[PDB]
C-alpha cells in the first residue's frame, strides 16, 4: 500500500529527512535518518547531548545480541556499537513487524550533531558497504525478503515539512511527466555516470572523467551538492560569468551584504540554471536534470520575519561528486535495485509560489562523449 507511505518523512535537507520507527517489545519509538549513502541500520543505544531518546535493549523482550560489535566511518562522523537483532514496525508503511539487524551506538564522534531530530540511521545502499562486512544483511534486504516486496524504493523530499519514502516501488501521485532512468554503474553506493555539467546553458569543458574520477553518487544523507575541487572551481567560475550581481551602492557596500534581502525581493533572478547530464539506459542517449537558483541559493531564517538570508548549497569535495539533498529536493528519485537503475521525475512539491524550481529533459545524444566516463 504505497499511498499510506505518502508523507511518512519529516525534516529538511539541512539536518536530515527521517522516518519514525517502532523497535522491540514493547515498542520503543525512534526517529530515523534516511541515508542512501550507507548500509547499516543503527540507533543510539545510550544517552547523547543531541538526542532526546535512545534504544534500550534491556527493555525489549525480543532483542537478541549477535555477539560482535561494529564501527562505521562516514565522510564525516563515525560511531561504534553492538550488533543484535530485534523486531521493527514502520507505522507509516508496514503494520506487520519484521526482524532486522540493529547496531546500538554507545560511542560517536561528529555524528549526532546539534540541530538534528533523528536518533538513528537507516543505511539504504548495497550490502557491499555494510559493516563489519557484506554478510550483515541490510534493513532493506530483510524487508524485501520478509515483507516480500519488490526490490525498489523511492524518495521525495519536499523541503525546497517532510517528504516520502516509498518502500517497494513508485507512487504515481508523487510525480508529473516522465521518469528518466540512468544505469547503476557499481552497486555499492548508488553510483551513476555523469556525462556533463552545464551552467546557464554553457557546458563546462572538462573531460567527462572529471565528474566521475572518484565516483558520482546519489546520497540522501548528504545535505549539499558536493563537487570535486576541479569541478567546483569550474562551476563557480561559470556562475560568476553568467550571474548579474547588483553593484555596490547606498546600503550595499560589502559582498557579505548580498546574503540578506527585504521587501519580498529575492536573489534568484540574478543567477543561472545548473544542469547535470546522465547517460540513459539506452547508451546512445542522455537526459538532463536541472536545478534553478531557488534550489541552490537556499533560504535560512526561522519563520516570523520580513527579510530572508540565503546560503549557497554547493560545496567542494576532496573525492566524490555527491548528488545530495540540494539536488534531490528537486526530483522524485527511484532507487530501482531490481533493474540496476536510478530514476528521476520532477517533483510537484518542488514549487515555490506556483513555479517549478527544477526541470528534467531529454533525450540528447552521446555521440560526442566517450562510451564510458567512469575511469
Amino acid at each position: 500500500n504505497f499511498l499510506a507511505m505518502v508523507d511518512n518523512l519529516q525534516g529538511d535537507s539541512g539536518r536530515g529527512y527521517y522516518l519514525e520507527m517502532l523497535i522491540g517489545t514493547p515498542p520503543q519509538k525512534l526517529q530515523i535518518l534516511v541515508d542512501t549513502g550507507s548500509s547499516n541500520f543503527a540507533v543510539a543505544g545510550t544517552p547523547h547531548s543531541y538526542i532526546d531518546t535512545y534504544f534500550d535493549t534491556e527493555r525489549s523482550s525480543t532483542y537478541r545480541s549477535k555477539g560482535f560489535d561494529v564501527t562505521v566511518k562516514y565522510t564525516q562522523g563515525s560511531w561504534t556499537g553492538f550488533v543484535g537483532e530485534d523486531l521493527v514496525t514502520i507505522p507509516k508503511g508496514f503494520n506487520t513487524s519484521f526482524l532486522v539487524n540493529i547496531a546500538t551506538i554507545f560511542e560517536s564522534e561528529n555524528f549526532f550533531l546539534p540541530g538534528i531530530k533523528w536518533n538513528g540511521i537507516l543505511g539504504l545502499a548495497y550490502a557491499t558497504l555494510a559493516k563489519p562486512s557484506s554478510s550483515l544483511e541490510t534493513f532493506f534486504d530483510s524487508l524485501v525478503t520478509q515483507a516480500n516486496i519488490p526490490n525498489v524504493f523511492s524518495m521525495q523530499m519536499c523541503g525546497a515539512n517532510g517528504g516520502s519514502l516509498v518502500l517497494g516501488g513508485i507512487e504515481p501521485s508523487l510525480y508529473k511527466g516522465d521518469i528518466w532512468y540512468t544505469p547503476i554503474k557499481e552497486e555499492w553506493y548508488y553510483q551513476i555516470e555523469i556525462l556533463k555539467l552545464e551552467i546557464g546553458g554553457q557546458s563546462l569543458n572538462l573531460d567527462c572523467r572529471e565528474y566521475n574520477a572518484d565516483k558520482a553518487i546519489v546520497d540522501s544523507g548528504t545535505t549539499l551538492l558536493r563537487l570535486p575541487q576541479k569541478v567546483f572551481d569550474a562551476v563557480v567560475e561559470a556562475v560568476a560569468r553568467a550571474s548579474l550581481i547588483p553593484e555596490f551602492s547606498d546600503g550595499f557596500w560589502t559582498g557579505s551584504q548580498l546574503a540578506c534581502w527585504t521587501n519580498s525581493e529575492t536573489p534568484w533572478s540574478y543567477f543561472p540554471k545548473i544542469s547535470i547530464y546522465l547517460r540513459d539506459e539506452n547508451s546512445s542517449r542522455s537526459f538532463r536534470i536541472t536545478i534553478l537558483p531557488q534550489l541552490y541559493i537556499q533560504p535560512m531564517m526561522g519563520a516570523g520575519l520580513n527579510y530572508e538570508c540565503y546560503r549557497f548549497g554547493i560545496s567542494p569535495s576532496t573525492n566524490a561528486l555527491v548528488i545530495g539533498a540540494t539536488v534531490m529536493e528537486g526530483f522524485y528519485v527511484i532507487f530501482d535495485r531490481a533493474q540496476k537503475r536510478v530514476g528521476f521525475a520532477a517533483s510537484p512539491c518542488a514549487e515555490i509560489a506556483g513555479a517549478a524550481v527544477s526541470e528534467i529533459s531529454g533525450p540528447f545524444s552521446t555521440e560526442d562523449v566517450a562510451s564510458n566516463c567512469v575511469p
Partner: antibody
Amino acid sequence: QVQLKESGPVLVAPSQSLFISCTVSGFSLTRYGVHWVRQSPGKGLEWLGVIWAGGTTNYNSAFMSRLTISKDNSKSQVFLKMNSLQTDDTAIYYCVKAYRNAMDYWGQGTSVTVSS
Amino acid sequence: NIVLSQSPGSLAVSLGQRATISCRASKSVDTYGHSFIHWYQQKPGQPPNLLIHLASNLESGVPARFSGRGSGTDFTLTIDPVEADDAATYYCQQNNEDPWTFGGGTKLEIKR
C-alpha cells in the same frame, strides 16, 4: 571620457587638517560612488572610505574617528577631510570611481606630506 | 579585517613564459559562490587599474593573456604569455567584509 582630479596641500603640518577635493568629469556623482584610497611605502594601499550616489558614506573603521568624506553634486566635487594628522599619513591620495563590485577609474593622485 | 597575503613578493619571468602569482585571504571572501576579491595592475608612476573582477571575470579590454582563478581563501593571477609591458606590481583586493583591504603586492620582473 571619465576623469578624476585631486587637488590637495602638498605639505601640511601635523595635528593640522588635511583637505583634498576631487573634481570629476565624464560621469555624474548622482549616479556613481567615489572612493578614497591612499598609498604609502609604510602601509601600502589602504581604502579610506566612500560616498555613494545617494550621499551615504562608509568608512574604514581605523580612520572613522577623524575622517569625513562629503560631496557637492552640483560642483562635480568630492571632498576628504582628515584631522589629527600623524607623520605616517604621508601618502599619495587618490579618488576613485565606483564600478560594479570594485573600482575602475582613478585620479592621478595628489602627494601629501605631513611635516612641520 | 580580512588580511590578504600575496606571494612571492617578487617574481622574474622570461618573455613568452607563464607567470602565476598567489593571493591568500585570512578568511573566506565568498558569498553566494562569488569571490569578492579583485586583481589590479600598477605600472610605475600610474595608479592601479582593475584587470580581473570577482576573482575570475576578465575586464573588458584587458588582454586574454590575463586570467584569474580561485575560491574561498586561495586565488591566483596568471599571465601567459608574459610581455615587456607586464613589468609592474600586481595587487589583490577584497570587499567581502569591511574595511575593503589590499594585499601587499607582487612585483613582476621581466627576465630579459
